[PDB]
Amino acid sequence: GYDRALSIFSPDGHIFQVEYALEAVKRGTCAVGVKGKNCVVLGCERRSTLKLQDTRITPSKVSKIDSHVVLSFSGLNADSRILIEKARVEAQSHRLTLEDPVTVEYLTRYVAGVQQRYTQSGGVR
Amino acid sequence: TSIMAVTFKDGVILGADSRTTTGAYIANRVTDKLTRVHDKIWCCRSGSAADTQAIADIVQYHLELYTSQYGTPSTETAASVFKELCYENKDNLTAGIIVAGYDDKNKGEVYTIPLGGSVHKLPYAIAGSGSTFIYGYCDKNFRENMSKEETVDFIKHSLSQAIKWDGSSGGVIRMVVLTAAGVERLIFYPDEYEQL
Amino acid sequence: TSIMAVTFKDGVILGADSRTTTGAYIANRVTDKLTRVHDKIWCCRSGSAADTQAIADIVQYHLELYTSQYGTPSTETAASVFKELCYENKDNLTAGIIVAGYDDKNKGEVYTIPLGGSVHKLPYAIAGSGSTFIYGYCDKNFRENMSKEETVDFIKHSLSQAIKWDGSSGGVIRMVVLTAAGVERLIFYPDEYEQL
Amino acid sequence: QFNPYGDNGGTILGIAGEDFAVLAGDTRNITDYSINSRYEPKVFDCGDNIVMSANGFAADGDALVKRFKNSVKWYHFDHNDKKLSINSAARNIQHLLYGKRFFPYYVHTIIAGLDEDGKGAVYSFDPVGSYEREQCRAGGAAASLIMPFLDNQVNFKNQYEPGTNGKVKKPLKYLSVEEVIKLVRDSFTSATERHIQVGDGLEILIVTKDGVRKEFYELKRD
Amino acid sequence: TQQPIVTGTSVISMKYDNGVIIAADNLGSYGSLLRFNGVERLIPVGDNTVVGISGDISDMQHIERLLKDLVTENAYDNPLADAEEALEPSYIFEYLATVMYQRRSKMNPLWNAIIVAGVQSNGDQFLRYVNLLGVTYSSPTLATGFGAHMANPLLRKVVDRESDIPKTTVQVAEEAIVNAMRVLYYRDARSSRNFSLAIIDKNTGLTFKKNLQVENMKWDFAKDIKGYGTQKI
Amino acid sequence: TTIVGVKFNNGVVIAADTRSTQGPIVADKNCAKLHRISPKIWCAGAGTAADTEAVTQLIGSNIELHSLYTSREPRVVSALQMLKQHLFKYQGHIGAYLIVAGVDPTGSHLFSIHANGSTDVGYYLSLGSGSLAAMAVLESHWKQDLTKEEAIKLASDAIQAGIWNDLGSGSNVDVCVMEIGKDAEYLRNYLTPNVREEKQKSYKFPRGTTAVLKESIVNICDIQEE
Amino acid sequence: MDIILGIRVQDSVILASSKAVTRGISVLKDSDDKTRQLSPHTLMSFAGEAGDTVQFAEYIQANIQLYSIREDYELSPQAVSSFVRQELAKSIRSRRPYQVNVLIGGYDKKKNKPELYQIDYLGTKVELPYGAHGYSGFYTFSLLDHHYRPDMTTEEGLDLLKLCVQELEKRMPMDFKGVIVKIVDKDGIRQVDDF
Amino acid sequence: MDIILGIRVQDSVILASSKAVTRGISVLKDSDDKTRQLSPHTLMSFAGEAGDTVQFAEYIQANIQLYSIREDYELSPQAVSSFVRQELAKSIRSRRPYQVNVLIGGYDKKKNKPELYQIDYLGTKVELPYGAHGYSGFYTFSLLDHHYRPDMTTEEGLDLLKLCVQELEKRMPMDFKGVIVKIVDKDGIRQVDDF
Amino acid sequence: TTTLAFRFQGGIIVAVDSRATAGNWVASQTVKKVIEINPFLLGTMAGGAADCQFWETWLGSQCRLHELREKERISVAAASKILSNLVYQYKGAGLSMGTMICGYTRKEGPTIYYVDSDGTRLKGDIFCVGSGQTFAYGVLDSNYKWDLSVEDALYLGKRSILAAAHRDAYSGGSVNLYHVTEDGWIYHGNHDVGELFWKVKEEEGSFNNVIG
Amino acid sequence: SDPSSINGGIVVAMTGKDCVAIACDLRLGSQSLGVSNKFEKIFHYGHVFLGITGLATDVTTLNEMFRYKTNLYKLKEERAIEPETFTQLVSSSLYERRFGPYFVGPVVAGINSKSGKPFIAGFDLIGCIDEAKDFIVSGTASDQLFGMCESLYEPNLEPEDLFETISQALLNAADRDALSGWGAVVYIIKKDEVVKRYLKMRQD
C-alpha cells in the first residue's frame, strides 16, 4: 500500500501540508456560529457566481449529525462529506453502546481526532 | 497362536507354540496348546483360551461316553462333535480348532474347524494368528507321505518362521506324534529353532 | 497388492502383481504398479491408488528439477523425497511405497516406506496385502549376491504364492530389472507362474 | 447387524367397475440396481372369485398370500363350503397382518373382486392391517406417479364442463372394462418411462360374474 | 444375527431346450484370504436336482446335511421312492425356501443364496432362487452375488425370454456358462480358476463335471500397458 | 449410467447411455453424457452430473488457452494430468468419474479417472453403475487389432448390456469416434431401441375444462415511447 | 422469547407481544417489551434465542436511524423489510446465525396504507393481513381466518386480538404473563396501556 | 401431571393438586382431580407419567377397599403408607416401573392425630409436617419453613397454602390452571369448592 | 388428521377430516376416521390407523359380549375402560392411539372419554386430537355453548374441521359428521372440503385472505 | 430438517407449437402450518421466465440475484438476455456454491426472439442442466408431476390446448401433495404476447 509520509516537519518546526490545508479553508465560503442564552445559530455564505443552480437538490451547507447536533464547514466540499459521514456513524454507534446520544463536546473530540490522525498517517493528506 | 497338524506316512503330528497373551503381556510363556480328547485323537487350540478349554473338556467327556458304549471313535466322529459345538454356538464362541487323530483303518487324518463352525478334511492344516505368515512356505514345502523325521523338520521350520514374525507367538515348540507305535511328546527350545 | 524389491549382485529388481480393486470387483486386471521416478530409480506402489500416483508424480517432478541443477540423484535422495511427503502428510495419506534404484557408486539399493512415513534401508523388501503370506518363504529363501536368473526366480516364486493366497492380488507378474546395462521389463502370465 | 427386511420394487393397481374389477401389476422383480426376474407373477387368483397382491418385500408378500389362500381353504372346511365374500376376506386379512403388529409384514396389500350385490370391489391395506374399501388404488414404487392421473381420468377431478367455467363439474359417467384396461395400460406405460423399478411386463387379472380372466402386455425392458 | 466367516462366491445357471445347467467355483474364502481350495458348492439330490449354494460355508454344510436327511426320510415306508414318489426339484426347493424364511423370521438366518436346478417328472425345466431373507424368484437365467451383475447380462443374450428356450441347444448353453465363469475369474477378486458344472437333461439325465478349469484366457495385451498416464518406459 | 471406451486400429471410440436419474426417478430420458474437452479429445462422465460437466468445461477451457499459448493441438495426457490434480486436491468431494479418450499428434489414447484422482490405462474400459454389465461384454468379445466398424459394434453392444440389465441405465446409445488424421464424428442417438408405443387414448381436454379466477396480459416489453 | 402477533386493519397495524422472560426454571421478569421502534412510522417485534434477539433488533434499529439521518428521509416499510430480510438471509449461512424471528408493522405515508411483514430467521419474507411466529399461529389463525375483514377499524382489530389472546391463555401450557400491544398508524406509534 | 402439595396442621391434613392435563401442545382439560379416596379417613394425591398415575392410584384404592371389607376395619394411615411404599419399591425393579409419585394424607382415629406421608416412585417414604413432589417444593418450602407452626388451625393452613399457590403462579413457567384443595380430618374427607 | 367430539344439550357431535399421508405424499382423501363400534357407540381415529381400527372393532365385540351376559347396554365409562386397560397392557411396545369414545346412555347422559396409548383416560366435554387440533379448538372454544341446537352444533363441528383442513397441511379431503343420540348415532353425510370451503366463504364472509 | 421440503411448492413447464407454458402453485408454509397463499414462484427478466421451488429464503435471494445480473447484462450487452444464455448463467451461479448450495429447483422457460424456437430447461440444486424437448418438473410433488406430464402431454399443442394440459397437470399433482396447493398460476407465452391466468382450486 501507499505509505509515503506527506505530512512532515520542516527545519523551522512547521508541518506545511497542515498549514496549506488551512489555506484551503481560507478560500472556502464564510461560516459563522453565535450562541444566545437558549439557542445557537449557524450562518453560511452562498457565493452568487453560480446561478441557474437548483437549490432544492444542491447540497446544503449545514448538516445534521444527529437530531440534536449540527455541523457546518469552510473548505473543500468533497472532504467535508467524509467527516460528516464518519461523525454520523459514530453518533449512532454511541447511542447503540452507551444508550445515550453524544454530547456536543464528544462529537467534536471525535471529528477533531479524525483530522489529527490524517496529519501523522502515511499515504494520506 | 501358531498351530498346525500334518499327516505323514506313519500317521499324523500336531505342533504348537507356547504363548498366551492378554494384550502385549505374555500371561504364560510355557503353555500347552496340544490337548488330548482321546488316546490317539488330539487337537490344537486357537482363539479364546476359556472357550477352547471349555469345548475340549466337553468333547473329551463326549468321546469318553462314546467309548464306553460303542468302542473307539473315529477321527471324523471327533471332528463332528467339535463341529456341532462350534456351529450351534457360533454367536457366543471365538474358537479355531484343528483336530488330528490316528486310526488303524484310516491312518492319519486332519480336520480343521474355523470360526464359523465348518469342517474341512485336509492333508495338513495351519491356524492361529501366526499361520498367516507361513501359507507361502507351507504350500511350497509340504509333500504327502513324508517320513517322521521330515515331518518334524517341516513343522519345526514352519512354526519357527511363524514365531519369528508373529509377536503373539513364541516360547517353546511343542509337538505330539500319533502313530501305531503310540504317543510321543517332543519339545524344542529357542536356542535350537531360532538358528534354523 | 503384492509388491517387492530385491538387491542382487548386478543391481536390483522390482516386482508386482497387476490387480486393482474396489471391493471384490477387479477394476483393472492389467495394472502397472512399477513406476518410474527417474531413469534408474523406480518404485512399487501399495495403498490408495490416487495417493500413490499423486506422490509418485510429485517425486518425479522433484527429481527432474534436482537433475537439472545437481545431476543424477542418489537412491537415498529419492527415498528422502518420498519420506518427506509421506511423513509430513501422514494424517491425509494411505501409501506404502518401496523405492529401488541403481547407482554405479552404491550399486543396487532398496528403501521401504511404510504407512507412518519412516524409512528403512534393506537388502530386500516386501509390501502390500499379499506380502503377509510370504514373510516365511522370503526369509528362508533370500540370499545376498544372487544372480539375475536366481533373483527373477525368487521374485516369481514369491509373488506366485502371494497371488495364490491373497484375493486382492492377481493377474500378470510384472518386473523391472535395474543394472549398469540398462532397464529391462519382464512379464509373466498366469499359465506360467500358477504351475510353479 | 442383520436386516430382516428387503425391497423387491414392483407396482400394483386395483380399479373397481360397475359390475367388474381389475387388479394389475408389473412382472419385474429387483434388488437395488439389479433385475432378479423379468416375469415373476405378483397378482394371484386366491379362489372364491378373489384376486390378491401383496407388494413390497417379496418374502413377506409370498408368505401373506400363502397364508390367505390357506385361510380360504379352511373357511370352506369349517363352514360347509360357504363362499368367502370380499368383505369377509378383507377383515380376515386385517387379523393376519395385525397378528404381526410388532414384527410386521413389510407389504402393501390390495385385493379385488365383486361384493354380494355383484358390484365391483377393491380393498387396500397398510403393513399392520388398517383397511378401506376403495374405487381406485395404486400401490408400490410408482404409486405416486399413477394416483394423480387416476384422480383426473377416472374421478374427473379438476375437470369442469366447457362454457360454465368452474360452476358445473364433469359428470361421473360409468366406465366399461375396455375403457378401464386402456387407463391401466397407459398408467403403467407412463410409470415405466419415469420409474427405474417399473418395466418388463404387465399382467392384469379381470374379475366378473363369469370368473377370473387374464391379460398380458409387454413393457419396456430397460 | 451373525456375520459370515468362511464364504463361497457366485453360483450361475440357465435353462435350455431339454433341461438346465448350473455352475460354481471351488473356493472357500476367509475374508480376502483364499483359504480353502477344494470346496464343492454344487450338491446333487437324486438324479434330477442340483442345489447350488453361495455365502457362509458352515451354513452350507448344515444345509447339505438337511438335504441328505431329506433323502433318507423320503425313502422311509415308501415303495416308490425311486419312481413316482421320488423327490422332485420343486419339493426340494419349497422345503429350503420354508427353512430360509423361518430362520430370517427368528432373526437367525442361514447366511446363503441358493439356486435349485432340475427337471420335473413331466420333463419341465425347474430353476428357482432363494436367499437368507427368504426371497424367491424364477427366470430363464439365474445367478448369485457377482454372477448377478456379470453373468446374467451374458446369459440373457442367449435366452432373453421364454420363447428363446426351445431354440437353445445344450452345446450353446454350456458354451455360454463356461464363458461366464471365465469373465467372473477376470473380474471377481473372491473367485478361483477351478469350478464344477452340472447338466440336468430330460433325456440324458444328470451329468456332473468336476475339476474344470478356466481356459483360453487373454493376458498378452498386458505387456503393452505401461504406467498410469504419462510414463512411456 | 453406463459408459465405455474401446481402442481400435487407427483410433479410439467412446459410448454412453442417455438416462439420468434422481434416486429411482428418471429426470431426463435423452441425456447427453459424451462431453467435448477439445475438438478431438472427448470424455464420458459418471457420478455427480454437475461435477462431470463442470470439471470437463474447466479443464476444456484451460486446455483451449494452453493450445493457443503453445500453438499446438491439445494432448490427451495434458487433459488427464489437469483433471487428476484438480480431483486429488478436492479429495474425492468432486464426484467425477471419467473415461477420457482422444487423438493428438502423439497418437490415440484411452484413460479413465476416478473421482479421488486415480488414473489407469487400457484398451477397453467401463465406468458407472452399468460398468459390470458392460465389462462382461467387453471381456467376452474384445480382441487385438479391431477395425473401426468392429469397435463401434463392440462399444454399443457393451452400452446395450448396461441399458437392458442395469436399472441406472436406459434409453439410447450415444457414440463418438476419434480416428487418427480425421475429424472426430459425434453420433448422437446412434441407436434408438426404446421408443414408447402409441397410447391407448388421447388426453387432450375440451377447451374451458379448467376453472379460472383472473386473466391478465403480462408486460414483457420495455417502457414505451410517447 | 414466546408469542408475537400482528394484524393489519383499514388504517393501522397492531402488534401484540408477550411480557414474560423465563430462565429455564424461574420467570425472571413479567414486564418485558419485545419491540424496537426503527423509525417514526415503523415498529419491529421479535422472538428467538436469548441475547441474539435484542442484539439483532438494536443493530437493525441503529442502521435505519443512520439511514434516516444521512438522507433526512424515512424509508418505506417495504424497503425496511427488504433490508431486514437480507440481513437474516446473510446470517443463516454465517459461522453462528442470528436465531431471531420478526414482525415488521409500518404505515406507508406515501401510499397511505398500513403494511405487515412476517420474516423468520432464515430470511423468509411474506406480506400478510395478519401473522405470527412460533406456535402462536396454530391457536389464533382459525379465529383470524373467520373474523378478519380488510375494512376493519382499529377498535375492531383490538377486539379480534383480545379473542386471540384469550384462546392462547386457555390452550397454551406456558404462562406468558399477558401481552404489550402497540398501534402503528399515520400519526406514529403508541402503546395501549390497558389490555 | 404437575404440582401436588400437602400440609399437616393441628387437627387435619390438607392436600392441594393442580387441575391441568396437557398432552404436549394443547391443554386438553382444566378440571382434572388428581386424587383418590383410599378409605374414609385416608386420601392419596398423585403425579407422574400419563396413564400410570391413574392405573396405580385405582389399583391401590381397590386393594385398601378389599382389606376394609375383609376385616371390617380401616387401616391406619401409617399402615396404608407402608403398603404403598412396598408396592413402589417392588415396582422400581420391574420390567416397566410405575413412574408415580404420591402424597398420603390421613387422620388416625386411634391416636387422634393427622399424618402426612411423602412417597416417590422409588419407594422413598418420609413422614412430614409439609411436603411436595417435583419442582413444587423449590418454590414453596421457604414460605412453609418460615410460617409453619404445629398448632395451626385448618383456616391458617389454607391461608399459608394460598400464599404458596400465589408464589407458584408468579414464578412457574407452566400454567397449571389452579388447584383442587381437599381436607382430611376426624369427620372424613371434603373438598373446598372455592379456591 | 383432525378429529373432534363435544357434548351439548342434544347429545354429542363427532366431526373428522378424511386425509391420510405418508410423509408429504397424500395416500388417501377417503379415509373413514369415525369407527362405528356399534349402533350406539362411536370412536375416532388418530395416531395409528391399524391400532385404532383393530382395537375399536375388538371393543365392539367386547361390548356385544357384555350386553349378552348382563342383558343391559354397556356404559360409556365401562366401554372406554376396557380399551384403556387393554392398551395399558401394551405400554412400551409401541402402540399409537389418540381416540374419543363417544356414547349416550340413560344413567350417564352424553359422555366422551379421551383414551390414549400411554394409558390416559379422561372424561370431558370438548376434545380435539390430531395435527390440526389447535385450529379446531379455536373455533370450538369461541363458539361453544351447552344450549346449541342440533343444526347449529352440526355446523360448528363441520366449520371447525374446515378451519383445520385449511391451515394444517396434513388435514383435508372431506368432512364426516355424526350426531349421537340416546337411541343411537345418526350419520350426517360426507362433505368435500374443496366444495365446502367456497360455499362457506361466500355464505359466511370468512376467509377474506383467500381469493375466490 | 430437510431444507428442500420445509416450505413446499411446485413448478412445471411445457412446450407447444410456437409457444411455451410455465406454471406454479402459491403456497408457502412452515412444515405443517400454511403461512401464505400468495407466494408466487415464477419471475421474469425481459422475455425469459424463471420458476424456483425449494427453500423460500433462497427462492427470494436467487430472484434478487438474477434480477441483479440480468440488469447488468442488459446495460453492457444492449439487448435482453435469451433463454439459452440465461440457462448457462443459472448453472454457473449455482455451481459456484458447490459446497454450500442454495436449496432450490429452478426452471427456465421462454422463446428465442431471433429464431422463434420454444425453449425449456431444469436444474438440480447445484447446477446440472436438464434440457428436455417436452416438459420440466420441480418441487415437493415432482413425482406426481412426472406421472401427469408423461400421460397428458403430446407434442405441437396449440396455445389454448397447451393451457388445459399444463393446468390439469399441476392441479391434480398438487392435490396429492400436502405441502403444495393454496392457489395456482399459469403463464402462456407466445413470441410477442404473454397471458397470465390464476386457477380456481381446493384450499386444503
Ligand SMILES: [Mg+2]
Ligand atoms: Mg515372538
Ligand SMILES: [Mg+2]
Ligand atoms: Mg436399464
Ligand SMILES: [Mg+2]
Ligand atoms: Mg390442508
